[PDB]
Symmetry: D3
Subunit: 329 residues, 6 copies
Amino acid sequence: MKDNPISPTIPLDQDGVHHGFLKLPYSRDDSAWGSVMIPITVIQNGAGKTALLTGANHGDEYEGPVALQELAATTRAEDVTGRLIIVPYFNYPAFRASARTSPIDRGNLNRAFPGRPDGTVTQKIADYFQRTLLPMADVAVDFHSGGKTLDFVPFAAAHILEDKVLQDACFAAMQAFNAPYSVQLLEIDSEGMYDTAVEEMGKVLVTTELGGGGMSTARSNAIAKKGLRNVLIHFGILQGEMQIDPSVTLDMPDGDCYLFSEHDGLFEIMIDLGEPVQEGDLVARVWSPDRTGEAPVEYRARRSGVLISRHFPGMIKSGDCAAVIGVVE
Amino acid sequence: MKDNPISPTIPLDQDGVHHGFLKLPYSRDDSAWGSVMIPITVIQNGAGKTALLTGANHGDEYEGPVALQELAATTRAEDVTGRLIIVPYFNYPAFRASARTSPIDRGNLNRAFPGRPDGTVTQKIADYFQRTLLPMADVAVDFHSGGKTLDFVPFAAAHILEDKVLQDACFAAMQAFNAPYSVQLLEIDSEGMYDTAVEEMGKVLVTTELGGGGMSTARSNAIAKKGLRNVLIHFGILQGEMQIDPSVTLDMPDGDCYLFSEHDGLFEIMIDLGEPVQEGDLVARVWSPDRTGEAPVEYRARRSGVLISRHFPGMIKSGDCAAVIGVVE
Amino acid sequence: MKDNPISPTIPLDQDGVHHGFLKLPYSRDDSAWGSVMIPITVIQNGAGKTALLTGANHGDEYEGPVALQELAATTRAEDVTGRLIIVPYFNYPAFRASARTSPIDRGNLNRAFPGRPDGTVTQKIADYFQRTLLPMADVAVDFHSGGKTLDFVPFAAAHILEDKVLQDACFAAMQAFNAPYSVQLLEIDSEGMYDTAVEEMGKVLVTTELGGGGMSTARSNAIAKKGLRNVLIHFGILQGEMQIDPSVTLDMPDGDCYLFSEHDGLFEIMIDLGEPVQEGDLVARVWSPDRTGEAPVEYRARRSGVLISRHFPGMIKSGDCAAVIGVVE
Amino acid sequence: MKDNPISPTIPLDQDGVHHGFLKLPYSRDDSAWGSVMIPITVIQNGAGKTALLTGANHGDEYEGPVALQELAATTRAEDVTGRLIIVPYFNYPAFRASARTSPIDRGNLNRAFPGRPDGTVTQKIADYFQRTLLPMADVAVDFHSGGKTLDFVPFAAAHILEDKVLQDACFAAMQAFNAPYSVQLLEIDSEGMYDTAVEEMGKVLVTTELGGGGMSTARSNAIAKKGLRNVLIHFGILQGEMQIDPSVTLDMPDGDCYLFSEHDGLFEIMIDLGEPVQEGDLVARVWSPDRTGEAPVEYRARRSGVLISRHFPGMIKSGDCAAVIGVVE
Amino acid sequence: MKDNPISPTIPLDQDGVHHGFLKLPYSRDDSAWGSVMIPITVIQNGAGKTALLTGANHGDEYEGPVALQELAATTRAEDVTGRLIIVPYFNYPAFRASARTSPIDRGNLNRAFPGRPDGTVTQKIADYFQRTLLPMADVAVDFHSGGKTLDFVPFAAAHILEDKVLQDACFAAMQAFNAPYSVQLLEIDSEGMYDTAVEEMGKVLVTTELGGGGMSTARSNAIAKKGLRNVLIHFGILQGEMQIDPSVTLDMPDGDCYLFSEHDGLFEIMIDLGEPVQEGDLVARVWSPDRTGEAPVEYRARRSGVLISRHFPGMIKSGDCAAVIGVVE
Amino acid sequence: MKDNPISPTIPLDQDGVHHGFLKLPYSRDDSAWGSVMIPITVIQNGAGKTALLTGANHGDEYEGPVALQELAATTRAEDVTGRLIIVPYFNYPAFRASARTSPIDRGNLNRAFPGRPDGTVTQKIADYFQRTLLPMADVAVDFHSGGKTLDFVPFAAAHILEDKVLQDACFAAMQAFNAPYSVQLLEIDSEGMYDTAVEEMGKVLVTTELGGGGMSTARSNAIAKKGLRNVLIHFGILQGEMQIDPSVTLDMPDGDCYLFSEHDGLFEIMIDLGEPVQEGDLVARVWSPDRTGEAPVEYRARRSGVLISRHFPGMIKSGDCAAVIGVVE
Ligand SMILES: [Ca+2]
Ligand SMILES: [Ca+2]
Ligand SMILES: [Ca+2]
Ligand SMILES: [Ca+2]
Ligand SMILES: [Ca+2]
Ligand SMILES: [Ca+2]
Ligand SMILES: [Cl-]
Ligand SMILES: [Cl-]
Ligand SMILES: [Cl-]
Ligand SMILES: [Cl-]
Ligand SMILES: [Cl-]
Ligand SMILES: [Cl-]
């Protein structure tokens, strides 16, 4: 396989604090000899694990990026035993466009793995992570949130894996994160995902869904920072005492959606995130976007639980997931 | 002045429940003989005031539209003493585009008054309301929310007016709405506004800011429905007992913004809506959108209070209002 | 009033055949020192009336432009007694974009009159015609067709005017055109129209609707050529014998539309142009564009007649005129 | 091969009338957890063939969709012996955009076969038809028309195939359709086509070209309905007597085009669809789109015949097929 | 007249060096409570004239902006006797888009005067300069270059004015600038121009054309810096000795263009900027953009001189000014 | 492999002068039966080499196209001994869009080789050149310039190749071209390039960089014409005496860039093309595009030399190559 064309502007394996870029050549109409300059910080000191920390895998998901920018700007080499490789804006082009996917190639980075060194920009990013960065990491933390179109109760997630020893390691790392909700689930759609790239190498992956709507709050930003610091202590890279608060564990959500809208319209949710519903209760109504006087279409809960995910925008489209009802363990 | 070209598909002054459209002729490349069909419901019965009820003055503001669609679809003529003229989607084209302003003319309907019958689509809407609908109304309720770029604590607002008798009437109607926050304020920018069109006629206007972010919640939707029902009881059009809960009154916010961003970047708010801050406390930080390792720009509270408004999206732009700190009476 | 900035590249009042442009200065991002070069041909010889002949008042209407390009390219000075001022592409920018309206300013040239010399490109075109060209003309012929969104039976039209002497002159010119259908109608929407600009000067105007759909046929192109040659003989500018065929006269259509769609969908017309319908007969059905199994919405004839106009495209929008039923005299 | 991700919202093999959707997951910036909901109706009763019926393979071709929506909405289970699988909008996204090709991926569905379950939306549609739906069908009817850029005399077509037994079966089905014109032709460009997908399985395919211009007429819509009903009787699925009218058979058109334009301009056709031309007769002229006085470019018939296809829009581009001359058998 | 809504973030009349913004409120879909933050620097010390210095009146013209950014960043209060008001990016939105005109309103700022406080963004900029900034200035320097579509020999220009005393003052200031070419000309198109706004107040205006093509060179940047420093010494605001080099004076160019292209194509200029041509010499040829083998269209010099302006891009459009031939005094 | 679908409208191997097109079928929404008509001229006479001559490999690079259009229009068969195959607009769609890459597929033709007959338009062009045209050529001349974003001193280039006999042949052809600068360099990025397609067949390739900025001058156009005529004499196809002027040879530039910008802003170059710099001298400064008063970012020469390449536009982006310093042999 050809070598990936990315070259860092900083060394990745030297002691100290280094701030620079992954330079990905990108020739196009408005820059014949141009590049995508992906921000990166490496902090390395003494002996320990290397953690690869990413935010904005999707460009409209902000909690991880806030936590990672602060981490990169405020952590001293002397506080670290091991290595932090910090990339707050993973699909950097998508992040710059405030979009889930890249405006260069419409690439969903989270489904681009293992990528290729001679493909689209998004594929070249994936390939560099697959073959260059991940092999130097022992563990990975990849932050997600709902994005502009979805909102979730704030959870950390661990995966059901064939390797039960790794599964337990991932579960322990997820507990350390200590988000207000905790999940362990089988990933239905594992092919091409970043999580799969990490896990199939035998490495612990920590992942989240920390809110959504294309925004973040002080509370959600604080969940990301605590969770990040906690897992970094768990991995032995940072030192100190972990913050431990109550967490609500959700029964195996099957990761699937059952309340798909069959109509475009004005979206009216009937309960808010985290709140209970009984089987048959109204979860949402879709009102006509183009006339008055018409009965709304109703979406009812198929079982009892709490609302764990919702369509975010005021307007919903045919085929959109309206809501997901989860079950507290 | 020429007559406005809008013609309703239903009568506006007949007893009963009528659902139809304001047909605004709109000739353009993709429809030579086309129209904007603005949904409208009229419900009239017995004797009483006429209320003109609008939502989606701005197209990305959803609480009012939910409350008004439900009102139009579920109210019986026999429940009404007076007249309801219900227009859930006021700048209908903006609403269809999920945008603050119309995609036809970039018109901000809320600053288009008094409009003109021979202008842009937005101006023709304004002119029809100014000269045809408002003169048949005794009172008006015009719902707002922050839109995609802003979020507010949920308030009902009444204006400081030169006519102190009307000012008191507006204040009383705002109290009846009974949102979780209550405001009375002088409008700095009154020229061209819908509120001014109503108030300068000597008529009570009820207005709100019920959340934002281009979405609504069951809680915010419920605030709109209760407030609407309450004011309609206050105006004698609907009957029943009002729902009265506690409300927090905000001292005269001067309606202005003091924490303008001077930088594009990643927006980190430090406290959430409704939460307290002391003078000099950090309210927000703007992180570099294109590198790591840089100290963030900080925005500090100029006085003590609670956060009443915030920039919503993850990314903030130079010149955006970051936040507004209000003071509890 | 300022002088219009248009300058012809040819003289407009010299004997012979001259082909050139109306140069309208147009400074913009992609040409700081640029122009719109509107094609024009002047043919002048001996003594007689001047006719001003325009096509593509709307840019997606093609019969007139075909007839006028052929006229400009094939008429000898020696065949003319008077003057032809031939502008096949009247809203030239709209014509170049294959659009009803200009892509520069969205201007509908047909409603831009009297225009202004310091306005938008479309307004400057109108102003030049209003103050420079029309005053040198005795008569005008302005070709229309339905455009991309409409189709009409092919008619020549004369207007009901306050000046009954001019009305009769216009009627006679319309009869000479001898399209397969003939109409005389009161124009409901006369303000700003080209037709009004001509007629209020006391001048004969010949106008048409010769088909539509953004295309033309050999038959429709031939209707335009015969009609043009006929009226030019009637006006004494060209010599020869007129072609006279049968014409169907339509009773005063009121120029208005009664079968507006209230739904977006798949458009199914039930009779074709020129064909009869009885009162209450189905004229069109609108099928759901996004599901199967739903009963279609039906549009029925309000009176007996023949179909004289129809919505053209497969997809119809809310507020589109579906069809117009006319009555044979 | 991976399973296709499409799941129907209805059963496809149960007796009765079922209306629903093929849910194709489609995650993108404006819907992270979204779908393309392709309308589908299944009608099954008793014993017989299964027919797979598609319209809007190309999204700007309307006759088939009208005929299929009516079929899905008006056919009773009790009228059927066999199964109808009805998909009026085959490239559903293209249909929603009124475009030949999908706005998601620019996919021409008619050249996307056999597709793949992990490709673009258009490829996933093709793959589902190739591996799931077609194998449950005995016969297929796939409607085409010219689209926005082309118009054809209305024909049903059967293909010259290597399997002469199937060729005869296809020919018989085409005769039953009984369009006003009949063709049997060798398909030059068979790779990737839907027709090839059906035929190479040993299955009868019925295909058409029923007009064009991005519109349909009552006559063309009626041709589609009769042809559909006729072939469904021929296949034994519906009962009744076929409608048989005269049909004109065209000699093997070689499916190729010889009158390509080498110029952009104003398109003037000289004869209309179905009308005769002699060898060397003028078929079309292209006039300058940007000046007057220039001789037009002429396109002449290479042999005698009738006009069977034409460029539709008023403006023609360099490299566009102007016209095709066919020969009556 | 209403007050302009712009408020500076810095004082404009205080001694010292102040860097900030003109905050122009700008509410729109992507920022409800947003602003255009126009950069501004004020440097004031001791006694003297105030100069108002602008670059990027057009956003794709770069020499002035380079010279003004350096001036604002490197000049000490102690070096100044008077006041510098420095706005390197005058049509700031156009500058941010690298466009001649604003992407907000397509406004050409140079023709927006006197503007209005309640108009478009561009008009509000003009109004603030007309009524607030210009009245506090004694002199103005407004830099231009050709932009993306034009290139000029580098000149400073002074205007022929009715006030001959001011005319002489402007001429003297232009000589001090000492560009490699010098011009004094009557402005044909004076209405709405910035230059007119300054001059009609009785104030000296210094203007330029320092190159073009949407770029600048070290030589052209150096012409701007020397010229700026020179005029600031001439006005008594900066101290030191002026740089004086040879300058070529051009005879009254009439500011008009005579070699307009009547064709789109590949543009071949035959002589370069500053080089001589004789009457009848070939100045440019336009080659067909869509075929080979065709004779090019030729543009010949109407009189002897030197090339002072040229169309820049490889592709030229109908109506573009190809070139202007000037005459050395 | 399938045959490429391109068919010439002229013979390619007949004596004489032939002007026509490569017809590449291209079906799309705005032309169902359309084509890309690539201009081509073939001139053949007597005995000799065939040269394949291309311009506008990138569509915004104009010197080659000017030289080749003139060559195709002015060369007589009788002047030729051999064959010229002249394609002035190689990526024809990119040329028509004045873009580096095709607007159809964003294809960079120069990296599309060997292409495929069933791929994108750009790939089909490449495939036709790879398998049809190149095999009939003995030599190739492929013109480049910087494009809209880059400017270069005008050089002819020859490559360092493994076949040292061919390397010497290429070097000799480059010397004959006799541009004002001469280079021989190892191509770092050879995979997929046109140059590689030619050279790996054992054939001499002549290539250039003759200026840039999306424009050309009489001087740069003249460099292209002389160089073309010279190499055609060297190859024995045209007769006459070569023009020989001084040429500056550049030491092996490594073809790489070391002064990448890490900042968006206003670009100020400090020396111009061809001018000397010493190690550590300032080559460029990037000024803030959104405020005043800030120190600029500086880019310094890493070694002594002359400026051989520069970023062209006024605005530079993060990751853009600012400049390249070369060394005179
Ligand atoms: Ca440790
Ligand atoms: Ca009452
Ligand atoms: Ca006569
Ligand atoms: Ca049967
Ligand atoms: Ca002084
Ligand atoms: Ca020879
Ligand atoms: Cl994903
Ligand atoms: Cl507002
Ligand atoms: Cl009109
Ligand atoms: Cl096809
Ligand atoms: Cl200007
Ligand atoms: Cl390249």
